[PDB]
Design a protein around this motif. Structure first.
Motif, short mmCIF file in Angstrom:
data_model
loop_
_atom_site.label_atom_id
_atom_site.label_comp_id
_atom_site.label_asym_id
_atom_site.label_seq_id
_atom_site.Cartn_x
_atom_site.Cartn_y
_atom_site.Cartn_z
N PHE C 571 33.03 -0.83 -9.76
CA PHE C 571 34.01 -1.09 -9.12
C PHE C 571 35.22 -1.69 -9.78
O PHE C 571 36.21 -1.49 -9.47
N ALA C 574 37.30 1.52 -10.86
CA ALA C 574 37.58 2.22 -9.82
C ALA C 574 38.91 1.22 -9.32
O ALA C 574 40.05 1.80 -8.62
N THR C 575 38.80 -0.09 -9.59
CA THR C 575 39.97 -0.86 -9.26
C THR C 575 41.22 -1.07 -10.25
O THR C 575 42.52 -1.00 -9.77
N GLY C 578 42.70 2.30 -8.98
CA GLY C 578 43.46 2.01 -7.89
C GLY C 578 45.06 1.43 -8.05
O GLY C 578 45.77 1.81 -7.48
N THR C 579 44.70 0.14 -8.97
CA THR C 579 45.87 -0.49 -9.18
C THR C 579 46.80 0.53 -9.96
O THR C 579 48.20 0.26 -9.97
N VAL C 582 48.85 2.54 -7.53
CA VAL C 582 49.76 1.61 -6.62
C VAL C 582 51.15 1.58 -7.35
O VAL C 582 52.02 1.63 -6.93
C1 LIG Z 1 44.46 -1.94 -5.81
N1 LIG Z 1 43.57 -1.52 -4.89
C2 LIG Z 1 42.23 -0.83 -5.20
O1 LIG Z 1 42.16 -0.48 -6.54
N2 LIG Z 1 41.23 -0.54 -4.49
C3 LIG Z 1 39.99 0.29 -4.94
C4 LIG Z 1 38.77 -0.61 -5.09
C5 LIG Z 1 37.66 0.43 -5.57
O2 LIG Z 1 37.39 1.07 -4.67
C6 LIG Z 1 41.35 -1.10 -3.14
O3 LIG Z 1 40.35 -0.75 -2.15
C7 LIG Z 1 42.62 -1.85 -2.69
C8 LIG Z 1 43.50 -1.98 -3.59
N3 LIG Z 1 44.47 -2.74 -3.10
C9 LIG Z 1 44.13 -3.09 -1.82
O4 LIG Z 1 45.12 -3.41 -0.84
C10 LIG Z 1 46.37 -3.66 -0.98
C11 LIG Z 1 47.09 -2.56 -1.08
C12 LIG Z 1 48.64 -2.51 -1.18
C13 LIG Z 1 49.27 -1.52 -1.02
C14 LIG Z 1 48.75 -3.06 -2.70
N4 LIG Z 1 49.28 -3.69 -0.34
O5 LIG Z 1 50.02 -3.18 0.55
C15 LIG Z 1 48.28 -4.91 0.16
C16 LIG Z 1 48.86 -5.35 1.36
C17 LIG Z 1 48.40 -5.77 -0.71
C18 LIG Z 1 46.94 -4.44 0.26
N5 LIG Z 1 43.06 -2.44 -1.44
C19 LIG Z 1 42.29 -2.28 -0.30
C20 LIG Z 1 41.39 -3.37 0.10
C21 LIG Z 1 41.64 -4.85 0.55
C22 LIG Z 1 40.80 -5.69 0.77
C23 LIG Z 1 39.66 -5.64 0.51
CL1 LIG Z 1 38.56 -6.93 0.66
C24 LIG Z 1 39.12 -4.50 -0.10
C25 LIG Z 1 40.01 -3.40 -0.32
#
Ligand SMILES: Cn1c(=O)n(CCCO)c(=O)c2c1nc(OC1CC(C)(C)N(O)C(C)(C)C1)n2Cc1ccc(Cl)cc1
Ligand SMILES: Cn1c(=O)n(CCCO)c(=O)c2c1nc(OC1CC(C)(C)N(O)C(C)(C)C1)n2Cc1ccc(Cl)cc1
Ligand SMILES: CC(C)CCC[C@@H](C)[C@H]1CC[C@H]2[C@@H]3CC=C4C[C@@H](OC(=O)CCC(=O)O)CC[C@]4(C)[C@H]3CC[C@]12C
Ligand SMILES: CC(C)CCC[C@@H](C)[C@H]1CC[C@H]2[C@@H]3CC=C4C[C@@H](OC(=O)CCC(=O)O)CC[C@]4(C)[C@H]3CC[C@]12C
Ligand SMILES: [Ca+2]
Ligand SMILES: [Ca+2]
Lengths: 702, 50, 702
Positions: C571, C574-575, C578-579, C582
């Motif tokens: 996790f 993957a974060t 994901g970061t 973005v």
């Molecule tokens: C960086 N990032 C990431 O790496 N992942 C993958 C994790 C491993 O799978 C995510 O799921 C992930 C994530 N940013 C997430 O929301 C952000 C996305 C952006 C575009 C920066 N804006 O607009 C806001 C409004 C700040 C929301 N989400 C989704 C998420 C949200 C809440 C919860 Cl509780 C769980 C997931």
């Protein structure tokens, strides 16, 4: 030959040499020379005092042109032909010349035949000249309604449509003059509201001259806002904004009594008038009734305060039901407090929507007619309040205006889906009485349909929260601008739909021969939602989905192959798919971006006034005492001439002072325009020439 | 002492910048016209003959 | 206290009441009152003629201010203190006052101590006043070179850096004055070229005052362009553009050496001068030497004649070798014909590159040291010509050519790769003497390396064709603008490079523990280029590639999982991924788009002048006699003072007429473009006031 011979093609009658010098004296300001020539012409008859210069300007027009009043009287004393010199004097805006022509009591003209002295004076917007003409019992034709089929309107538009259109525009230019409205309008603010609104509607029906009518409408909106800018005390502002235009009638006690003129401005879409800082400041005082120092408070105290009242919304709602007159039962009536309580009562509803899928009981996935669960029972009273509240506005407001607001369309769909879910849940409960494995359920099982309908409503309910961004100073201006960009995007979606249908028809026409059965596909799965996509273009319905998903790159390239491996057919189908990708993703997608960037630039310069107008509507919806109780609790069960006459007298007194201040400011704002023209240089030169000739006339030892 | 010199230079520059910055207005044209009218009336008081 | 008491903080010496009225007379233009007060001041000594108004304006400055010459002489006759009056008169630009002060012969000042009458006159750019001062044997300090370490430059900078910088800028403002250059410069065009170029370099060294020096440089460029605009005949234009400033040798054959002044303008980057329409028109006549009516020809005729000459390029090249003086051997020397022949000789080379992958003898995939094939043999002479042309062009160009244009960098890399391919194929031919299956070849087999190097050169050779877009009117302006946007994009890649490294380090630090072996992977394939991607973040080198490919969406999400299935580690990894997505795709990518849109708008307003400058360099490279033969055929093996004096006399005559026309035009352009100011209104009012006082002094009657 090799040269172009130039000649006068449309020759006019030539002017004698004697007349040429006579006109030159008038331009030079030579009073003495003019006086002799006029006197000489009285006996010898050698020069024509009415000499028509091919340009059309006689001596009288030249005298008016230079503002040389004394020579003007000298010509007028000699019985020169007048024609329509009053219009020329009015256009020049010389008060002295206009007064002289009024007291004085085929041809080429610079004005159309429909122009009258009063209409032209209003076009110039000169307060002094308009007052002179209005004092002499003038009138202006009343334009017929836009959608008029009378004999005169139809017949006039038959003989001469061009003249009919120009005549109507000339009348509206005069009526929209701020000077005329301030002088002859009993209620200038109301007159500007109605006149500007009528001109906006005219700019739509008369689309050929839309720009002209839109400028007049903007001019009326500015005048009303500028009149409000002249208020100097809160008492003056209170009198103006609370004025009722002799309504009489019956007023609903559940409604908000005050701000009658402000509500009229909102009805006519007077956004600049509503967004005026003094009007906004007064509104904020009512909105923050219970917080005298809200602006001075730190953002932490504000945020901490909001949650405190929000958590107590159940208690405040109960108090308003039990002891409305009590100290605690009056808090909910404050507009900002009521807004927070409604928002808290809605965030609670959305929280329970999350809890619907967070609690799972095993062996309950197979009950065909399951009864409502714990979360569903608590949600039920909220839904009934939401449906009851929307119907309460159906009769209260009316069908026409309700649908005008896009947020009401989402409210209608959300409530309809919730109603359908409840009925479907009831039918399943009655029709079935046991538990069966969900795998054997039919495609259209009532329980499955209810679950899908409920989930769709949850998305709509959550999206409703975006409308609350209007209350925020940071998010409201951006949210309002985003909604203004959606109308432009919708137009572009018309062109993309034509492209999608054109290629969907072509691809389906090519691939429908090779449709295969689900039994013959791996895992028995048919379509593009399978792990191994297949039958992408077998049917038109499937083809439309496949082209939609390729916009996001979710359609694999191998779907263009057929089992028989017809090489020419596969290449042609892949070229259709490739051409569609180029048109939609490389061309149309970028065109939408370019148009959005251009449209956002224009929207960005009016964002503040647009947001403030939207927030004013939000605030005013909480001033009334009708819907005080949030949805959770809203379902639980003389002679008036003296008052109206005095209220009108105070309004007239304030209007009189506002017009006086406005007129002076506009007269002041012109003298500092920071510009000059040739007509000023001509006038200044003529003054010196006239002075030089007069001084020289008194020669000494000759 | 430095502040005194800076203010002196700044005041002159601002008084200088105005005389070349903005164009004429209607109040200037009215002022110029009135000057000639006043001169014309005053001169006409001494009428050698009439 | 609740009130702020306002007082004069820095109080000056008050002015007596007698002096106040004396100054008021000067402003009013009251000559009679001033004359008596001055005469009275000779006896009573009550008022000081040098009364220093706190503003610093004495009577003399007021007299100069209103342009009242007659009064100014009145005060000058009375021995008033002059001080810095000449500078004030020069700034006012009153020729009468300047002549009076010149013939006439710590206080607060509006000018810095370094300003002199000649320097200030040049700052105003007044031709008449500058001529008056230059006639009086004036001089201006010569500024030292930008990079000077002399005792004076170092001492002045340390003693007073602020004053030293301001003094240098004041001198350059005077030297860059078009009026001064036209009056005192022997060769105004050359002076403007050098002065403008020197100012551009100064704007880089002087970071703080870059804008000031860049405006002066632009002013010099405009002056030279405007001088060329005054040419009225082709003979005048020919004389100017063909002028040689010096006569040091300069007789090397095979060189055009006929547009020396134009070549000097190109060297100094005078883009506006080069892009002048008359200069461009003359260049097009030379470029189209063999086509007198090229512009009038239809686009089909133009295209048809291009392929005819292109297909004939082998024949024209041969003729130039056999009989250069023959009729056919002279066609290749025409610049446009030569350009087409070179382009045709290059399109043939690119065509053969395509043929290298089409005709390879089957069963020869296993020859380790294969000899050159048929296509390779034909390609060989082209490559030798390309390498010879670059070395030949570098001998005369100099080792500084690689830093001028970025196209020469591609030519160096392309030729280096071709040389490496030839040597590598030679080593393989000698080292190996048989055929072996290609599957058993090692990673660094010489034949495999040569094939990769050859393929890379092919891409570079094809991309070279983009430089030919400069010759086209439709593609050239766009191609030039695209190359100007690449420098801004390169700045952005610096921020993205740091982001990529920051996340690559973090991801590799987390995943390097779980690296697996290729033997343990399906199909024995390790990395992200396998069908089932794996080991994406095992090493830093692999991690950088994985993050690069995710920009295009080619990295699957499952690469974030490890075999041991450590849920928390997966996790977190993957974060990080994901970061990174973005930051790079939602934020940085859009920021580049916004930056590019803004930068393209500025580039778009200068595209025409920039393209024309680029096309001029392209055209002039074909005027010379040196590189006539395309690469395929390019490897096959008296008193001069009298001429220079006459050539200089004609140049001076033309320069004299150009300056006369330019000076009149600038004096003309000021009287019809500059608006009125308060200084004009004050002057006009004073004129009437002075006339009024003079008339009233002598009533003239009775
Ligand atoms: C960086 N990032 C990431 O790496 N992942 C993958 C994790 C491993 O799978 C995510 O799921 C992930 C994530 N940013 C997430 O929301 C952000 C996305 C952006 C575009 C920066 N804006 O607009 C806001 C409004 C700040 C929301 N989400 C989704 C998420 C949200 C809440 C919860 Cl509780 C769980 C997931
Ligand atoms: C629409 N379209 C498509 O459908 N396919 C898939 C075919 C089935 O696989 C293609 O390959 C395909 C294609 N447009 C292609 O070039 C176009 C692409 C666009 C962006 C429109 N610009 O810029 C130009 C410069 C006009 C070139 N190419 C590539 C191609 C080119 C030549 C040859 Cl001989 C073969 C392929
Ligand atoms: C994590 C995301 C989904 C946000 C959390 C969900 C909700 C709890 C949010 C969504 C929108 C929010 C609302 C957006 C706007 C406002 C207006 C705001 O009004 C003001 O007092 C604004 C004053 C100002 O102008 O500064 C009060 C909070 C409120 C109702 C917010 C309350 C909290 C809400 C409902
Ligand atoms: C599909 C590819 C592989 C073709 C080969 C590369 C092209 C980019 C080359 C081939 C022919 C070249 C053209 C040959 C001749 C001309 C005419 C020449 O124009 C003129 O002199 C006429 C006036 C004008 O149009 O400006 C400008 C360069 C241009 C367009 C050349 C630009 C580069 C071109 C198009
Ligand atoms: Ca609603
Ligand atoms: Ca090169």
């Amino acid at each position: 030959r090799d040269r172009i011979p130039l000649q006068i093609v449309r020759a006019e009658t030539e002017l004698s040499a004697e007349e040429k010098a006579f006109l030159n004296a008038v331009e030079k300001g030579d009073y003495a020379t003019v006086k002799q020539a006029l006197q000489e012409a009285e006996i010898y008859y050698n020069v024509n005092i009415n000499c028509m210069d091919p340009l059309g300007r006689s001596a009288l027009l030249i005298a008016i042109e230079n503002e040389n009043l004394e020579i003007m009287e000298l010509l007028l004393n000699h019985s020169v032909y007048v024609g329509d010199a009053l219009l020329y004097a009015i256009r020049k805006e010389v008060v002295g010349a206009v007064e002289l022509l009024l007291s004085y009591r085929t041809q080429f003209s610079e004005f159309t035949p429909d122009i009258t002295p009063i209409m032209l004076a209003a076009h110039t917007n000169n307060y002094e000249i308009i007052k002179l003409l209005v004092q002499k019992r003038v009138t202006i034709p009343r334009p017929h309604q836009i959608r008029c089929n009378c004999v005169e309107c139809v017949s006039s538009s038959e003989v001469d449509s061009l003249r009919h259109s120009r005549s109507r525009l000339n009348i509206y230019k005069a009526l929209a003059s701020p000077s005329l409205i301030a002088l002859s309008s009993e209620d200038p603010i109301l007159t500007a509201f109605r006149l500007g609104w009528e001109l906006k509607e005219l700019s739509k029906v008369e689309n050929e001259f839309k720009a002209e009518y839109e400028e007049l409408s903007q001019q009326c909106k500015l005048f009303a806002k500028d009149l409000l800018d002249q208020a100097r005390s809160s008492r003056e502002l209170e009198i103006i904004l609370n004025h009722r235009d002799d309504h009489s009638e019956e007023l609903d006690p559940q409604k908000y009594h005050d701000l009658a003129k402000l509500k009229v401005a909102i009805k006519y879409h007077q956004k600049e008038f509503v967004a005026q800082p003094n009007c906004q400041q007064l509104l904020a005082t009512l909105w923050y009734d219970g917080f005298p120092g809200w602006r001075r408070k730190h953002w932490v105290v504000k945020l901490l305060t909001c949650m405190t009242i929000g958590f107590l919304f159940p208690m405040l709602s109960i108090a308003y039901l039990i002891s409305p007159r009590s100290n605690l039962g009056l808090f909910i009536k404050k507009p900002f407090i009521k807004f927070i309580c409604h928002t808290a009562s809605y965030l609670t509803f959305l929280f329970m929507l999350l809890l619907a899928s967070q609690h799972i009981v095993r062996t309950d996935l197979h009950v065909q007619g399951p009864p409502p669960t714990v979360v569903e029972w608590m949600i039920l009273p909220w839904v009934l309040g939401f449906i009851w509240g929307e119907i309460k506005e159906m009769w209260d407001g009316g069908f026409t205006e309700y649908i005008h607001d896009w947020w009401n369309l989402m409210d209608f769909a959300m409530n309809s889906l919730y109603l359908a879910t409840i009925s479907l849940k009831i039918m399943a409960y009655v029709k079935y009485n046991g538990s069966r494995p969900r795998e054997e359920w039919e495609m259209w099982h009532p329980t499955l349909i209810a679950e899908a309908l409920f989930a769709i409503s949850n998305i709509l309910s959550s999206l409703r929260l975006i409308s609350l961004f209007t209350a925020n100073s940071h998010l409201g201006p951006l949210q309002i601008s985003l909604g203004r960009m959606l109308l432009d995007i919708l137009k572009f979606l018309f062109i993309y739909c034509l492209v999608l249908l054109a290629f969907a028809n072509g691809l389906n026409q090519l691939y429908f021969y090779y449709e295969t059965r689900a039994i013959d596909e791996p895992n028995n799965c048919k379509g593009i939602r399978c792990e191994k996509q297949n039958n992408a273009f077998s049917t038109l319905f499937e083809t439309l989905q496949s082209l939609f998903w390729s916009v996001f790159g979710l359609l694999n390239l191998y779907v263009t192959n057929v089992k028989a491996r017809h090489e020419f057919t596969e290449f042609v189908g892949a070229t259709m798919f490739g051409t569609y990708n180029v048109i939609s993703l490389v061309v149309l997608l970028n065109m939408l971006i370019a148009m959005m960037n251009n449209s956002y630039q224009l929207i960005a310069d009016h964002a503040d006034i647009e947001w403030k107008f939207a927030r004013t509507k939000l605030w005013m919806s909480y001033f009334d005492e009708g819907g005080t109780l949030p949805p959770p609790f809203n379902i639980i069960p003389t002679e008036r001439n003296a008052d109206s006459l005095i209220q009108n007298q105070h309004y007239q007194e304030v209007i009189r002072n506002l017009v006086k201040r406005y007129v002076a400011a506009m007269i002041r704002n012109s003298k500092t325009h920071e510009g000059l023209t040739e007509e000023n240089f001509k006038e200044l030169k003529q003054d010196i020439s006239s002075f030089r000739y007069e001084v020289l006339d008194l020669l000494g030892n000759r």
